[PDB]
Amino acid sequence: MLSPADKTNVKAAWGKVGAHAGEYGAEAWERMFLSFPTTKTYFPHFDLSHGSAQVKGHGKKVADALTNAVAHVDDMPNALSALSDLHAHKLRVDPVNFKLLSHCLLVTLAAHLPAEFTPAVHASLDKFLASVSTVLTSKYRVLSPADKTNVKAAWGKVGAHAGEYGAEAWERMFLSFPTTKTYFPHFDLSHGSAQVKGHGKKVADALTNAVAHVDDMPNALSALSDLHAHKLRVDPVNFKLLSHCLLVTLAAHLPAEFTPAVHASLDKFLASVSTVLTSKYR
Amino acid sequence: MHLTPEEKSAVTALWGKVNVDEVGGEALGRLLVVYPWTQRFFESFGDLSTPDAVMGNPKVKAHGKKVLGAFSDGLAHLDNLKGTFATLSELHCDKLHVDPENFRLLGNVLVCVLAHHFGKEFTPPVQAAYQKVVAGVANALAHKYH
Amino acid sequence: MHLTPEEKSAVTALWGKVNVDEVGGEALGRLLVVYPWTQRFFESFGDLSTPDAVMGNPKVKAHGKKVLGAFSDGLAHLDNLKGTFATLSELHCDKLHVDPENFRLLGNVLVCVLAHHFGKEFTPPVQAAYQKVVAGVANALAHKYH
Numbered sequence: 377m378l379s380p381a382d383k384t385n386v387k388a389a390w391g392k393v394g395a396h397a398g399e400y401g402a403e404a405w406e407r408m409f410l411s412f413p414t415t416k417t418y419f420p421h422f423d424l425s426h427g428s429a430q431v432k433g434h435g436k437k438v439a440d441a442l443t444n445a446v447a448h449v450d451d452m453p454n455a456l457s458a459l460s461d462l463h464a465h466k467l468r469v470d471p472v473n474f475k476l477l478s479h480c481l482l483v484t485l486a487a488h489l490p491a492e493f494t495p496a497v498h499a500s501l502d503k504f505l506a507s508v509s510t511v512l513t514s515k516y517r518v519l520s521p522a523d524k525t526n527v528k529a530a531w532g533k534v535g536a537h538a539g540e541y542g543a544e545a546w547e548r549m550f551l552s553f554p555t556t557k558t559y560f561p562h563f564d565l566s567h568g569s570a571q572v573k574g575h576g577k578k579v580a581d582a583l584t585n586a587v588a589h590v591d592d593m594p595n596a597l598s599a600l601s602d603l604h605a606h607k608l609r610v611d612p613v614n615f616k617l618l619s620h621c622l623l624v625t626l627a628a629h630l631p632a633e634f635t636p637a638v639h640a641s642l643d644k645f646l647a648s649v650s651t652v653l654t655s656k657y658r
Numbered sequence: 659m660h661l662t663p664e665e666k667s668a669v670t671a672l673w674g675k676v677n678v679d680e681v682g683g684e685a686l687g688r689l690l691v692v693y694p695w696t697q698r699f700f701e702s703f704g705d706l707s708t709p710d711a712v713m714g715n716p717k718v719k720a721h722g723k724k725v726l727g728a729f730s731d732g733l734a735h736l737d738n739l740k741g742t743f744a745t746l747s748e749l750h751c752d753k754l755h756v757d758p759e760n761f762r763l764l765g766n767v768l769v770c771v772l773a774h775h776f777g778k779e780f781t782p783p784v785q786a787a788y789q790k791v792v793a794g795v796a797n798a799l800a801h802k803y804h
Numbered sequence: 805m806h807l808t809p810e811e812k813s814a815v816t817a818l819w820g821k822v823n824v825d826e827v828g829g830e831a832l833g834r835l836l837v838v839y840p841w842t843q844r845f846f847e848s849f850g851d852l853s854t855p856d857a858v859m860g861n862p863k864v865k866a867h868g869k870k871v872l873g874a875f876s877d878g879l880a881h882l883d884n885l886k887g888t889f890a891t892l893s894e895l896h897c898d899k900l901h902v903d904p905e906n907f908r909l910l911g912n913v914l915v916c917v918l919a920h921h922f923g924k925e926f927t928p929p930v931q932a933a934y935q936k937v938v939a940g941v942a943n944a945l946a947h948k949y950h
């Protein structure tokens with residue numbers, strides 16, 4: 377995820393943070409609780425009053441973990457292995473909150489490091505915090521053999537309808553989430569549109585290819601990865617909306633096959649596909 | 659909450675056929691299986707280790723029924739979701755400490771379950787109407803958070 | 805858009821110290837650098853090949869001035885963001901085809917720029933106030949999307 381120049385900027389920025397990591401860490405959490413009050417639901421056992429020893433201590437633990445991460449940027453999943461376990465199995469924090477903390481850590485850094493917080497270093501830091509968040513949420517639920525079994529079973533039954541289901545998924549998405557239509561100003565989006573049919577089929581075919589190469593997805597989708605990142609430039613948030621509408625389409629067509637277990641495996645599979653397709657964006 | 663006449667007719671019409679009991683247990687169970695971190699609120703429900711355990715758990719079925727029963731009542735007051743859910747909103751914040759992002763997840767799971775149950779009858783325009791409704795309910799439940 | 809009197813005063817007090825042209829150039833440039841997919845709208849602006857080229861691009865700075873001036877004007881109508889931005893909303897949807905997620909990214913980049921610009925004066929409660937306002941602006945700009 378991180379280029380070596382990225383790693384250079386983070387180490388330069390964090391070193392300068394230095395012995396202030398603790399106080400900056402506490403400030404970041406205080407900013408989050410105030411700006412995003414829903415995050416307080418994970419701390420009902422804390423005194424969240426300003427300057428609270430619990431917040432100060434928590435901030436210092438969190439900053440140290442980030443220092444450890446900066447120190448081993450080339451091996452983050454192993455360095456944060458324990459913390460990964462802890463968040464996935466015990467704390468069980470919804471992944472959306474990680475983006476909120478990352479944003480407040482950036483605001484904190486910005487307010488304290490005027491000289492250092494250049495546009496390039498800003499970018500690198502945002503990428504680094506996203507990578508940390510990814511590692512910390514990586515064991516929450518990549519595809520186990522049972523998942524891969526469930527996906528191939530489900531997609532096999534799709535079979536020769538894969539095209540028509542793909543069109544339906546897109547149609548469902550444009551109607552349910554109208555903001556996605558901004559990427560298609562050059563299409564007729566009316567029901568039955570042959571443009572939507574052709575697009576849906578191409579997308580479906582691409583997913584068939586991913587299923588076939590489920591163990592080697594980054595290479596099989598590499599070209600599509602390049603296309604979305606550097607030409608189409610679709611905001612990553614939209615991939616979750618299409619994934620949901622694919623799930624709904626499958627559920628509507630596979631009464632027997634869409635069990636809770638297969639539902640979970642499909643959701644994981646579509647999230648991995650989405651991760652691959654946005655991997656080269658930055 | 660504003661819907662078009664077409665949207666409201668579709669939502670109310672399909673809901674008349676929903677057995678809230680059966681759909682509610684299905685919806686909560688799939689939430690716990692597909693997004694297992696949500697199990698953090700239900701430690702007292704017993705055995706949640708496998709999908710088969712979750713889906714057949716009596717506490718899960720019972721709670722699902724309660725949750726969708728309240729959802730059902732909200733469907734009778736689409737024009738005023740914030741007013742309808744204010745008390746439950748305060749409860750989920752102050753007593754239960756539930757991250758409102760969970761309301762969004764359940765919303766989407768419920769749409770999947772309706773598609774699974776009703777098949778082709780759950781058409782794209784019908785789904786769009788339900789997506790507006792579950793977003794409206796989630797926002798209403800999150801409204802009194804502080 | 806509902807703020808407390810304190811929150812509104814803190815927002816306006818700091819904004820009086822803002823050089824809008826400068827900060828607009830800064831915020832748009834950092835958006836294009838930090839989230840490069842947003843460059844898709846601006847291929848007619850010329851060279852965006854490196855951060856310095858973006859930050860130094862005259863077309864970028866000019867757009868940044870235009871955008872933050874309308875934001876600035878909006879701060880005088882906090883009680884009516886939706887009405888103030890209705891026509892801008894229709895234009896960004898029907899003509900400019902801008903995914904409203906971009907408005908949220910710009911809001912967050914702007915908050916960072918204000919922190920960089922004002923340092924310790926950009927306190928946690930002042931940031932909280934600005935976070936409500938940029939969400940309010942993003943929501944109002946997305947309101948007429950269809």
Ligand code: HEM
Nearest residue numbers: 415418419437438441442459467469473474477508509512
């Ligand atoms: C950059 C992201 C994060 C890092 C590096 C991180 C790291 C840590 C660390 C090091 C601990 C303490 C472990 C110990 O006791 O030794 C911890 C605890 C905890 N974290 Fe995370 N965390 C992150 C994000 C989050 C987010 C986004 C939330 C919730 C909004 C969260 C909530 C918690 C909770 C509730 C605890 C336990 C507090 C206690 O009772 O002491 N974490 N975290």
Ligand code: HEM
Nearest residue numbers: 556559560575578579582583600608610614615618649653
């Ligand atoms: C599972 C996720 C996705 C996959 C596998 C996928 C795949 C594809 C494929 C195979 C193509 C055609 C490339 C060619 O012409 O050879 C394509 C094009 C395109 N994709 Fe994606 N896509 C995904 C998600 C999205 C999302 C979420 C959006 C936007 C809401 C999007 C927007 C587009 C656009 C704008 C085009 C070009 C259409 C045209 O003008 O022909 N994609 N995608």
Ligand code: HEM
Nearest residue numbers: 696699700724725728729746750754756760761764795799
């Ligand atoms: C459609 C959204 C929802 C509605 C309308 C709803 C409604 C309700 C109602 C009516 C109760 C009954 C409490 C009582 O009898 O005093 C309740 C409690 C509760 N809800 Fe919610 N709920 C929703 C979503 C959720 C979600 C998604 C979660 C967490 C993942 C959740 C967690 C809880 C918990 C933990 C309780 C208490 C259970 C107990 O007493 O053991 N709720 N809910």
Ligand code: HEM
Nearest residue numbers: 842845870871872874875892896900902906907910941945
């Ligand atoms: C604070 C949020 C924003 C406000 C208040 C705003 C406002 C404006 C204004 C006042 C115009 C001029 C329209 C006219 O000439 O009638 C404009 C145009 C435009 N905006 Fe937005 N904008 C915002 C966000 C964005 C973002 C984030 C993007 C895309 C990344 C964007 C892309 C554009 C484009 C491409 C144009 C037209 C360029 C031209 O014709 O020269 N806007 N914006």
